[PDB]
Amino acid sequence: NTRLRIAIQKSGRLSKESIELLSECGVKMHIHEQSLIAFSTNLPIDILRVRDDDIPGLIFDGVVDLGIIGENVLEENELERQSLGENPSYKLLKKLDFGYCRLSLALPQENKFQNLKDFEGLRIATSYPQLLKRFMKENGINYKNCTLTGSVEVAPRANLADAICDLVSSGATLQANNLKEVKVIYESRACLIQKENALSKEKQALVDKIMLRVAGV
Amino acid sequence: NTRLRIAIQKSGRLSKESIELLSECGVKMHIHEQSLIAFSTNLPIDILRVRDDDIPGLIFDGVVDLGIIGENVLEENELERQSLGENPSYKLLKKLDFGYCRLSLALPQENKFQNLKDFEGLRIATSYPQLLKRFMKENGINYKNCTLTGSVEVAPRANLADAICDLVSSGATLQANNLKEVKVIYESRACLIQKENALSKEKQALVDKIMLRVAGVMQARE
Ligand SMILES: Nc1ncnc2c1ncn2[C@@H]1O[C@H](COP(=O)(O)OP(=O)(O)OP(=O)(O)O)[C@@H](O)[C@H]1O
Ligand SMILES: Nc1ncnc2c1ncn2[C@@H]1O[C@H](COP(=O)(O)OP(=O)(O)OP(=O)(O)O)[C@@H](O)[C@H]1O
Ligand SMILES: [Zn+2]
Ligand SMILES: [Zn+2]
Ligand SMILES: [Zn+2]
């Protein structure tokens, strides 16, 4: 249809700043508890509120025009799609001023970390199995996977794993679980991305305008 | 690492009945409602309480010994793993008497369904993209995919997709969203599975004991 589709995180760490950025680019809308879609009141724009993990896929499959997502989630999902034999593509428009975090290897507080080789043959729990797999291959370290979507930091205490690969900024969660960060494998921020296949002149024009305004802020 | 590990859904449509099946089979336990780990108080068993989507991976990777999971989630993740060039493997111990649901192609109620080839070219929203992909390749209908983890039934109303492939039980939600069920592609129930690699003799003996009890419990509940 005529309206531009912009996917953002429904509720989590990027939601507040995604909405703030959209407001500053002249997109007026009301966010309440709409399950999926919020309609801009001043421009022909639909805001899709989704789980963050779905946003790369929506961009790859051409379902939405624009997307605001963390680079970690984007790349996790690109790698998955590549390992399926697919050719995911997207246009990067801008790296943004929020969503700063890093994906790091971590061990229990009372361990003797000398070297990356100390991870050899360990069981490593993570929500980012593709990112971890690529890092370990690149550095020639063999390991055992444990994929968990939540409570990753509880995995060593639960005896499910010897170590974790998790997102960190402040270190507070690691500290709470008596773990210590030992090696960063990936640095991330929020980015604005666009699908591959060409937008309408109507829609592309509207994107260029928002983009002009994005640069402004 | 010698306590038997069993993964179950932490909170959701299988969580209550998984815990109750365990109690019915004589596994006494205390649960702290927000926590990943719980322990049997009378048997050497850890109960790991996780997101259901993680259970098949945990079994395939040998991280736990047993799991209770919907057949739909098991199959979707098996297909995913196979399409990634992996070799996911598990033992099916038992099909269980709860978790009944079905995965169904569905269209707006105000919409003429003559034929399964009506889906040709349609954008289809789903949480089960591998299961959809297999069914559509098998039947020869081409389509465009839209993967959504939740709110799938709202996608047509939101003009993200023309049709959905949706998990339903009662069938009430679809009516609520002004959509009609036109073709079942998968029928699911809860199952009990075990990892591929052999358990120690003592742990396999505990599993054999649990299995006899599950069969008796299931007889008694008819
Ligand atoms: N401590 C942090 N500070 C800033 N940004 C973070 C931090 N941790 C994670 N992020 C970024 O924000 C994104 C969303 O984080 P959040 O914890 O809300 O994800 P989620 O729980 O997977 O969300 P959803 O419910 O949509 O699945 C992460 O993928 C990452 O890009
Ligand atoms: N009416 C139903 N709709 C969806 N799933 C159902 C239904 N009835 C039974 N189930 C079963 O319950 C499983 C759990 O789905 P649930 O609705 O609890 O939410 P979820 O988001 O999958 O849970 P989690 O938070 O663990 O990811 C399904 O995958 C399926 O096997
Ligand atoms: Zn309002
Ligand atoms: Zn997420
Ligand atoms: Zn789930």
From Swiss-Prot, chain A:
Q: In which pathway does it act?
A: Amino-acid biosynthesis; L-histidine biosynthesis; L-histidine from 5-phospho-alpha-D-ribose 1-diphosphate: step 1/9
Regulation affecting activity: Feedback inhibited by histidine.
Enzyme Commission number(s) from the entry: 2.4.2.17
Cofactor(s) for this protein? Answer: Mg(2+)
User: Which GO terms of type biological process are on file?
Assistant: L-histidine biosynthetic process
* A GO term for molecular function: ATP phosphoribosyltransferase activity
Q: Which UniProt keywords apply?
A: Amino-acid biosynthesis, ATP-binding, Cytoplasm, Glycosyltransferase, Histidine biosynthesis, Magnesium, Metal-binding, Nucleotide-binding, Transferase
What reactions does this protein catalyze?
Answer: 1-(5-phospho-beta-D-ribosyl)-ATP + diphosphate = 5-phospho-alpha-D-ribose 1-diphosphate + ATP
Subcellular location, in the record's words? Cytoplasm
Q: Which GO terms describe its cellular component?
A: cytoplasm
Q: Tell me its family.
A: Belongs to the ATP phosphoribosyltransferase family. Long subfamily.
This chain's function reads: Catalyzes the condensation of ATP and 5-phosphoribose 1-diphosphate to form N'-(5'-phosphoribosyl)-ATP (PR-ATP). Has a crucial role in the pathway because the rate of histidine biosynthesis seems to be controlled primarily by regulation of HisG enzymatic activity.
* Record-given protein name: ATP phosphoribosyltransferase
Q: Which lineage do the record's taxonomy fields give for this organism?
A: Bacteria, Pseudomonadati, Campylobacterota, Epsilonproteobacteria, Campylobacterales
